[PDB]
Design a protein around this ligand. Sequence first.
Ligand code: ADP
Ligand code: ADP
Ligand code: BM3
Ligand code: BM3
Ligand code: CA
Ligand code: CA
Ligand code: CL
Ligand code: CL
Ligand code: MG
Ligand code: MG
Ligand code: ZN
Ligand code: ZN
Lengths: 308, 308
Amino acid sequence: GTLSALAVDLGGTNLRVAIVSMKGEIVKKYTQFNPKTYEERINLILQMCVEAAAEAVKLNCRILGVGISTGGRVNPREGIVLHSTKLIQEWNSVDLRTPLSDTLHLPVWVDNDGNCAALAERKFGQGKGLENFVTLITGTGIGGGIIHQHELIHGSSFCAAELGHLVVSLDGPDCSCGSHGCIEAYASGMALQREAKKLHDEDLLLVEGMSAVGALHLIQAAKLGNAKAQSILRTAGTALGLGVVNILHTMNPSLVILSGVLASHYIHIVKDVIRQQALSSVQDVDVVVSDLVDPALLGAASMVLDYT
Amino acid sequence: GTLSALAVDLGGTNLRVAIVSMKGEIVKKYTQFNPKTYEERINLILQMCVEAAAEAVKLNCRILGVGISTGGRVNPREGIVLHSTKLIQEWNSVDLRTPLSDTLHLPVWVDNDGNCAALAERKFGQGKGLENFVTLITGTGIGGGIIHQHELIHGSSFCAAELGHLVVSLDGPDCSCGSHGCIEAYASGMALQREAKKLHDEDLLLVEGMSAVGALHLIQAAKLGNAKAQSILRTAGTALGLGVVNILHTMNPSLVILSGVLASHYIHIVKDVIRQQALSSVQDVDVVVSDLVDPALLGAASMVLDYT
Ligand SMILES: Nc1ncnc2c1ncn2[C@@H]1O[C@H](COP(=O)(O)OP(=O)(O)O)[C@@H](O)[C@H]1O
Ligand SMILES: Nc1ncnc2c1ncn2[C@@H]1O[C@H](COP(=O)(O)OP(=O)(O)O)[C@@H](O)[C@H]1O
Ligand SMILES: CC(=O)N[C@H]1[C@@H](O)[C@H](O)[C@@H](CO)O[C@@H]1O
Ligand SMILES: CC(=O)N[C@H]1[C@@H](O)[C@H](O)[C@@H](CO)O[C@@H]1O
Ligand SMILES: [Ca+2]
Ligand SMILES: [Ca+2]
Ligand SMILES: [Cl-]
Ligand SMILES: [Cl-]
Ligand SMILES: [Mg+2]
Ligand SMILES: [Mg+2]
Ligand SMILES: [Zn+2]
Ligand SMILES: [Zn+2]
């Protein structure tokens, strides 16, 4: 059999389960909405993992374990989701290792989704071999992961690299975390979706050449000359850039990897903000867009593949 | 002889040279203004060190080496000041080890002043024994130092822990670093001095019970009910607090140490901002005011004392 992992990724919108090969190929991926309650969510994770495990046999893949990427603060040693922002409701003090390992008879690893993104970039991506790098993954929310001396920083209370909650305003838009002025509150998918929905509500988004509203609509409108959309995207990208400047002046990594579909749209503004505002000693920092399709899911697999 | 170090601290205002014992007692300290040019500055450092070395003999202290704390990005391995903001002009690509070691016939260590502050807190202060902690030192500028796994983080280009240049506004006041919205531009001594000088210019600082204007005047006025002074100090303290929140959500240290005379004035507002805005998983972070008189100078001594 192809040595493989089962990988789960639980984000602000979607719950995905995949069979991933030891080379980082996604063999098969199942996608559902992340349910809004604990009971539904745990049951769906189990269902999807059991079905994926059965298909793996039919696809001749030998599953070595299960890795779970999730939003929230996580204790990876104990496989417990400690605390989540409201992007995932009813997801506090949750033992994921026990129910999954009991159901599937497999070892189970769990980490925060940004930390998994970092692990993917270290194994399969542009972080391979590097002593220090940081990643920011834009999705519903913004996740972060920090590699220092080749290893993740988890922090004294497993809250390191909550990079979506870097604050770049004294005021600013409200964040789902309960704060305001967080980069996530400016630049996440959810933030852009809201701003697009607000413009579309006021008949102010659509422009000649387009016609369920989201971040990509705002970006399309901006390419097609919508002035309000361009301004929103500049503000968003500037905020993210300032988050990155904070990271540079804190950790001073050699490389920043931006991932998620919005990364390509933000990279130039992030580079410009660094150029215009960061200290000269961090100007040699490389800022790139990830070459991985799905860092969090790949990073969940990497925990199994490297540690089983 | 009492085993001792010579310690130099070069900040935004003052150049100090001290004889420091292996127990962290400042035996004797000399103070001058930090000159504004390279030639004057290097000559004064040398003068003051030669005089301090001669007095050490008369005080029966055996000097084991020289440690230098300086503002700027520093390569400690080579003893070179790489780049400085304009708080210290003409302080770029400067080899400090060679001229000092040639003049004094002593080994010489050099690091950034915030990194020295961290080293002092690790040896003599509230950081002793801790795997991870961060310090912010408020003076003319704001300096930072990060201990992770018991050791300083210097970063990939010696620009880690430039914590005064954490950005907490999309706009905000200009920073001497050339950016705007940096915590230093809100909350440093220089920032408060400027704001006090601005009020005093408009006859708006003095209040019944007081009568060369600086940060302590603004703070005195605020205690005595000056509404404009209280508001400025709240803004300043909120900005610093947000800097700290960024640190928590980046590194998630167990302890944050605030030092410099302004620390006592800011600690309650910093704690309040953390309370009101940071994630619940960092709420257990201890935030304290330093118990050391002069962390940078003590930390410069600690390099000699621990490594000679
Ligand atoms: N192709 C796309 N490009 C940009 N944003 C997208 C795309 N598809 C979904 N999104 C946005 O990203 C979020 C869903 O992305 P995903 O990475 O699946 O999120 P999560 O990990 O947060 O569940 C939503 O905000 C949605 O608008
Ligand atoms: N006792 C004090 N309390 C608060 N601020 C002070 C005090 N003495 C000096 N300052 C301020 O701090 C700066 C000088 O402090 P110092 O720690 O000697 O600075 P540096 O390391 O920046 O040379 C100036 O902004 C000055 O107004
Ligand atoms: C559920 C929750 O707390 N999510 C956080 C953070 O932990 C995630 O990494 C991030 C990206 O999904 O979203 C949010 O910022
Ligand atoms: C000269 C210079 O670049 N100083 C910086 C920083 O390096 C210092 O640590 C800080 C405190 O002195 O001031 C400034 O923020
Ligand atoms: Ca993270
Ligand atoms: Ca520093
Ligand atoms: Cl809700
Ligand atoms: Cl100048
Ligand atoms: Mg995801
Ligand atoms: Mg000083
Ligand atoms: Zn937030
Ligand atoms: Zn600055």
